[PDB]
Every structure is written in structure tokens, then in C-alpha cells.
Design a protein around this ligand. Sequence first.
Ligand code: MG
Ligand code: MG
Ligand code: MG
Ligand code: MG
Ligand code: MG
Ligand code: MG
Ligand code: MG
Ligand code: MG
Ligand code: MG
Ligand code: MG
Ligand code: MG
Ligand code: MG
Ligand code: MG
Ligand code: MG
Ligand code: MG
Ligand code: MG
Ligand code: MG
Ligand code: MG
Ligand code: MG
Ligand code: MG
Ligand code: MG
Ligand code: MG
Lengths: 117, 177, 51, 136, 76
Amino acid sequence: MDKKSARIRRATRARRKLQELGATRLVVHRTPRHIYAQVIAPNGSEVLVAASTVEKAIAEQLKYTGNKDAAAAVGKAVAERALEKGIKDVSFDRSGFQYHGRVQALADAAREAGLQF
Amino acid sequence: AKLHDYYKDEVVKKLMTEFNYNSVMQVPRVEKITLNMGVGEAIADKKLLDNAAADLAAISGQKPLITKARKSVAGFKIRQGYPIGCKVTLRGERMWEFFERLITIAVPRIRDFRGLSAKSFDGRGNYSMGVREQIIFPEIDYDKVDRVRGLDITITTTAKSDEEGRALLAAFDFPFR
Amino acid sequence: GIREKIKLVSSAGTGHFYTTTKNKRTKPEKLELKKFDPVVRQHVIYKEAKI
Amino acid sequence: MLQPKRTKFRKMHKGRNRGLAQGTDVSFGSFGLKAVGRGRLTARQIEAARRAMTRAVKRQGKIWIRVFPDKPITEKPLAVRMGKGKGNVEYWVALIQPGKVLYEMDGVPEELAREAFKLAAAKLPIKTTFVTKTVM
Amino acid sequence: TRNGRDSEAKRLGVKRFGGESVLAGSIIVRQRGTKFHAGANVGCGRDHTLFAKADGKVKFEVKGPKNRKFISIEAE
RNA sequence: ACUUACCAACCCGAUGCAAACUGCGAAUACCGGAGAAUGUUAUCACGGGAGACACACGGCGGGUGCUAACGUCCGUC
RNA sequence: UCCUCCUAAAGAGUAACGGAGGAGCACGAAGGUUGGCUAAUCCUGGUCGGACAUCAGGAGGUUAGUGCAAUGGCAUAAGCCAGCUUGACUGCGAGCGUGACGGCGCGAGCAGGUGCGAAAGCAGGUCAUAGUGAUCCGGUGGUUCUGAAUGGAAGGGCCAUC
RNA sequence: UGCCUGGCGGCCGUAGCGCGGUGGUCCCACCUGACCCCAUGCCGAACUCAGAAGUGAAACGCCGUAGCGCCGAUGGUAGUGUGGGGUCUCCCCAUGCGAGAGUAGGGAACUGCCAGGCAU
Ligand SMILES: [Mg+2]
Ligand SMILES: [Mg+2]
Ligand SMILES: [Mg+2]
Ligand SMILES: [Mg+2]
Ligand SMILES: [Mg+2]
Ligand SMILES: [Mg+2]
Ligand SMILES: [Mg+2]
Ligand SMILES: [Mg+2]
Ligand SMILES: [Mg+2]
Ligand SMILES: [Mg+2]
Ligand SMILES: [Mg+2]
Ligand SMILES: [Mg+2]
Ligand SMILES: [Mg+2]
Ligand SMILES: [Mg+2]
Ligand SMILES: [Mg+2]
Ligand SMILES: [Mg+2]
Ligand SMILES: [Mg+2]
Ligand SMILES: [Mg+2]
Ligand SMILES: [Mg+2]
Ligand SMILES: [Mg+2]
Ligand SMILES: [Mg+2]
Ligand SMILES: [Mg+2]
């Protein structure tokens, strides 16, 4: 299995469970250069809020978009953006990535900024 | 690391003009070097495996994985999960350091050496060879060896063909016919 | 057939016990497991003894 | 004499023999012998008929047998009462439905094939008829 | 050697069909494996019994890339 | 090491067979909702009284037997 | 006696000295959870090494695997590994299935307490379906019950277990 | 609004495979480095971290293409409920239902949310 098909397999179980639970998930996507965060509604097809390093307002304050400091910036931003829209309780979907390093920097910052999970 | 430099500084260049590749990312690369010992008779003397393992460890410079019987087969009287060999997968710095030791001094110390075969390619650019005696590696202390023992070498490549795989080794001055 | 009944006894003062089985050949030592003691209403260490 | 070399199971329900045949065209040879009636062909019958048609052509040309006796038939012997287990397998039949091409042939003149198939048909317990290859 | 044996029938099968209104907890199908899978408001027991987790109507569907069978429960 | 008019699995093309085969699949039957007409409640519950638990043939679908039996065993009328 | 398949007529059930097999156990991990992983078979190359051991690539795509019969499941694996572990928890249970009955099964949720996980969550044994013996009598431990004038005790009850 | 890309879903092969072509500013990918976080029953392959010298070779995406997969009528055929009938191991008639395979043919998916790059 190639890296990607392998990760999607790694992600399927947790997503079905969250789907079953009807949870609003904070979905993360990581790349060597960029990291992305999306709060998606239980229907699985609507993005309520989002943040990432490909948007200039965020990458502008960052040294390198593909590291842990950046991950902390993205996480903090989704949280804020999300809280301002009344969104508070979500579930973390690490999307087949280890709960670690960058993903965990993003998660920790998102919690820091009041997002509940 | 010296032979990784020689790959970059010298080999890439040679193969690009040899096969007229459009992208340098087509030039064949040594991907990994895998050493193996089919021990096989550790089933009677478990210690034969330990000494094979330690032979590889000292040859490769990294802890060997000991490989189990994938499948019982009554012909060699082996049950599934029986330890029956040991292996080491070399990459990066270690593979290159070994690759040189192999060419620069191990292989030359084969008895009445006349070169290695150039037809031992699998049909997709990967090369395989055996050594009969592990004492050709100077990491093995001739006085201490419990026993002379042999060893598989396979050089896995990103060449798609044997013609390409051969140019890659040839460019390192790999000894052939 | 060879598998014998044993009782795990509460390490608290209570005389509460769980009952289970054991292969005494392959596993000669004393089975020891945290379990819930309904008399002190807490999880406590339980230790094999004879049935 | 035809027989399955091995089978999953030794014995078989009686079952029934309704329907029209599959394999109703001459698909290999030039001529065919076709069942018009319904019934069971035993391995010995199939053999007797194969011999007859093969004498008739002096082992010239080529012959195909489209049927295969894969149904085991059991029987209870004399002086045994009912029950006490299903009988023992004694022989093998092919189930025949109207329309099955039984044998095919080619490499001989039509006149000789009709004769050979005539001799063979006299060995069979079901009425048959002579058929020919057809474009489409 | 000798035959002559069989086991008691286990009465597996669908207990409530499409459209049927059931109370939560009601067994909808007894099965040996997951021929049917648990969908929304339907649970899977240890013997792969599918049961209602909510009051409502039984609903069979076919879903996903493997064309699998799912039983769910619709509020009514 | 080389070869023989021998046998040859797998694979490709063509042709059939299966109660314990299915990449297909009815008619019916069965479960559930709603509605009219009809039907001496034909329904369910509790309670008083039982009898019965040797079945037969015929039709259809089958196992067994020989698609034998006024045979034998189930299903259904 | 029990389990699996067919007969069994596309819901359940359905007989014969009908056709085929299996159970009367195993496991403190082969249980729980988190995290990860992915077979068979064939072709080519490779010391000893052979049709078949272990190594590499390619085809293949679950035909493998599942402690064990068969059938149905299984990739989000139910298959395979490791870390931490004892939910193989105690009290209950809306609502159901299956039984003439005795019974047997499935079960979300509630209270207490626990393991694993960052968290959502998962765990009341094992992919599921065999692996079993009513009552009586008696043994062992526990006990706010009983205790033949009264206080005890014996014996009885109740709970656990043999 | 238009093209391009990434993410998350709907749908579950008319949607897949193959063959040919094609893309790197952006995105994606390979990639670079690895003491360290973290990892390998061996291996920085994978997981992971710090990056940006190189390349779209592979992968991925897009466009093309009926070798295959897939979908697929009409008509006939098979079966079958009810009623009737025959030469009753099997069939026929009336009525209703009506496959499977094959044939013609279709087919190189369709679609929503958010974000990024480019252009008018
Ligand atoms: Mg009554
Ligand atoms: Mg009686
Ligand atoms: Mg009777
Ligand atoms: Mg009767
Ligand atoms: Mg009679
Ligand atoms: Mg049935
Ligand atoms: Mg029926
Ligand atoms: Mg297991
Ligand atoms: Mg997991
Ligand atoms: Mg070989
Ligand atoms: Mg915790
Ligand atoms: Mg006493
Ligand atoms: Mg007294
Ligand atoms: Mg007294
Ligand atoms: Mg890398
Ligand atoms: Mg390319
Ligand atoms: Mg066309
Ligand atoms: Mg129609
Ligand atoms: Mg249809
Ligand atoms: Mg059709
Ligand atoms: Mg078709
Ligand atoms: Mg936009």
C-alpha cells in the first residue's frame, strides 16, 4: 500500500465511529509544506470553518509553513474562527496521521483557544 | 558516504548521457542493499543461528532480524515460526559504506577471484549474488569464527531493466566478466 | 479435562471470591488479578486459592 | 467407460429430469446425433454406441461425445429390506432432455455418418435424430 | 461412518421487516455473520443480532462501495 | 547435461453437469401499514368440561425404494 | 445429549435405520484497549539450498488466515504484532427473540467502581453458532434472617461455591 | 463567472483496468537533512521531525481511446399462481406474473461544501 491509501485505511474506522456518533469533527490534513484544519458538519459535506497555511493572512506571520509553530497557528485560528460561530464541542479526526508532533501541536493550540474536545 | 558522493558527482552524469533521460529522476538509484543468511539447520543447533546473526551484525553494522518459517513444509522438516535465517536491510549511509567495503575490499578477497557474474539480474534491474565464505569480510575474525558460512546479497535498484541496472553498477566499477 | 476450578479471593477482609479455571501444568504459579469486591465496593487485588 | 474420476460426494438424490436440453447445436463436428426423447443414458450405453459408430467409420474422421455420465445411481440388492441406509453406487448415468446433441462427427461423408449414427442409435434407450451443422 | 445426526434449528432470520414499527431494543434480524450491518439507530450484538436502539420504523438499505446491506431505524 | 510418435496441471478459446456450486434470479408464500365491502366475533384473554396424540387415499413439491408397490417418510391442498 | 450443512418446496419450522462431518474442550491471553500491519499462489534472480526453508523484484488480490467441524461472516478487518492492562467487573435492565414447560438467548441504558485512549470513545470475556446435567441429599465460606422456657448453641434460611 | 489544485462528503464500476498524451507559478508528489521529538521484532522504507537544492521520472490529477470490465433493451425462451386438460417419470390450453443467458445498443462518470493559485 502506498503512503496515502495506507493513511486513508488508517482513518476509516475513527471516521465511521464519529459518523455514527453524529459528532462535529475538526478534521486535520498534513503535508510536508502545509497543514490544514476543517470543522465539518455531521453530514460530512459542509465545512463550517477552516484554516490553513495556504492562506496568506496566516502564512505571513510564519517562518516555515510546514512545521510545528505553524501547526500551532492553524489550530489556534480554527478554534477562534469556530468559537465566533458558536461552535464549541467537536471531535478530533487525526485523519490517519499519528496523534503527534504537528497534528498534536494543532490539537493542543485548538484546545488552548477554547475549543472543546 | 564516499560512494554516495561518487554517485552524485559522477554516476548520474554517466547514465544521463548513456540513456538520454529527460529527467534526472529517471536515473537509476541504489534503493537498498539486503543481506541474508538461510541458516536452515539452526533447527537442531539453535546456536548456529546466533553465530550467523552475529556474523551479519559485524558484517553489516546493524542488528539482524531473524526470519521465521513462513510456512511449515515437511521436506525440510520445519514448522511455522521456527527461526531459520537472519537478514539485514541496508539504506543510506550504512548501505553506501557497506557497498564500498564490498567492492573495495571484501569481494576482491574471494578465493582466486575473477569477477562477479553480470547476468544475475532479476529482469527488472535488481542484482543478486552469493558469497560462499563470510570470512572475506574483514569484520569477521578468522580465528574466532565457529564455522565458515555463506550469505546472500541483493542490491535493489530503481532501474526498470537489467540493461539499466547493469550500467548503474558498472559505473561504480562493480567487478564483472 | 485437565483444567481445574480455582477461586480468587479478595485481599480485603471480606471473604468474597470469584471462581475461574486454570491449567495447573503449564501455569503453576498463583493467578492474581485486580477485581471488584462488592462488599467494600472497590477494586482490590484478588489471589488464587483452592476450590 | 466414462465415469467421474473423483467427486465431492458419493451419492446423489434421485432428483427429476424436467426441461429441454442445453447444447442443441452441432458445435464441433459436421454432423450430430440428437436426443428427441427424455431419459437416462448409462455409461455402458454410451460406450456401446461409441463403439458402433466407430466401427462403422473404420476409425476414420473424428468423434465427439457431448454427454458425460456424472450422476451416480445406487441400488439395493436382493433380500435386503427397505431402509438401513442408502444403497451402494453401482453405475453412472447422464440425464438426457429433448434436444441434446449426444455425439458429433466429422471427416467423413454424410452418408457414412448417417449409417454410423444409425448403428449407434440402436444401442440407446431414447429416440434420436440426425442433425447437421448450421451457419448461425 | 454412520450418518443420522443433525442439530436443533436456531430460528435465525428477519424478525421485523421493512416499515414495521418497533420499540427500542427489539431484535430485527438474527444472523450468524453480518449479512446485514447495523446502520443508524441499530446496534450489533455479540452473535451479530441486529437490534433497535430507538423507537421507529425498520429500514433496509444498500450502501457504500461494497454494496453492503444495512438495517437502520427511522423515526416515524 | 541432451532427447523421444508417451502422459501432462495451470492458462486461453469452445461445450455440458450439481441436494450439500452462485459474479444471476422469478411465480407464489410470508411479515408490516392503510382502506371499503362482506362475514350471526369469524379475533384475543381469562375461566368450567373435554376428546385426541394407530390416520387413509388423491393432487402438487421432494427424501427413500426401481420417479416399483393399495410401499415408506416429510411439506402443502 | 449437543453443534454445522443438505434434504427443507426463496420468512420460521418440518420426517426416515436419508446424505456428509464435528463437540463433551482450549485460552490470564488466544481476554480488554490504544497504536500499527496485511494473506494464498505463480513467474524471475540469489552461497551451501534441492520441486519446497530464508533473501529481492514482479504478477496476484484474500483463493490466505480465523485454537477446532460446517455454514454464514470478516479489510473500518473478526486475520497479524507491540505497549499498557484485568470489563473474563458487582448491582440492575427499557425492549425483544426462542420455547408446551423447566428454561435458553440478544440487549441499549441506569448506579457503583475499573482498564485503555490526547480525545470522540471502547471494554459485562474469545468472529458467531458445540464444549453439557434439572431436583434431592450433603460439604465449604460469608450473613442487619431464624433460634421450641430465656441467654447462647445445634440445625434451618439467605448469598457465594463444591 | 472561467480554468487549475487540495481537503471532506454524496453516489458505489455507464463511475474500474489498460493503452496514448499531458501538468509543476500555485497546490500535490517524489525530494533534502536527521543529532533531536518520534520510529524500525533489522532498516529514517514506513511512522516522524527540520527543511527547499532538484524533478514531474514515479505517484497523482486532467484530456484522449471501445482491448477488457461494467451497464443493457425489444422480441423470443425457461419457470410459475389460479382454472381446465392429455398419451400423467412428462407435458398442453385459458389467464395473470415472467426470468437467466444472448442480441442491438450505452459507456472513457455525475454531483455538493470549504480553501488555495491563475485569468478576464
Ligand atoms: Mg382457551
Ligand atoms: Mg403415542
Ligand atoms: Mg403418531
Ligand atoms: Mg401422516
Ligand atoms: Mg400407504
Ligand atoms: Mg426455510
Ligand atoms: Mg417456504
Ligand atoms: Mg482471536
Ligand atoms: Mg485499531
Ligand atoms: Mg526459484
Ligand atoms: Mg486517561
Ligand atoms: Mg456443618
Ligand atoms: Mg430447649
Ligand atoms: Mg432458647
Ligand atoms: Mg521522506
Ligand atoms: Mg509523469
Ligand atoms: Mg459506442
Ligand atoms: Mg417486463
Ligand atoms: Mg428482473
Ligand atoms: Mg434480461
Ligand atoms: Mg449480463
Ligand atoms: Mg476560490
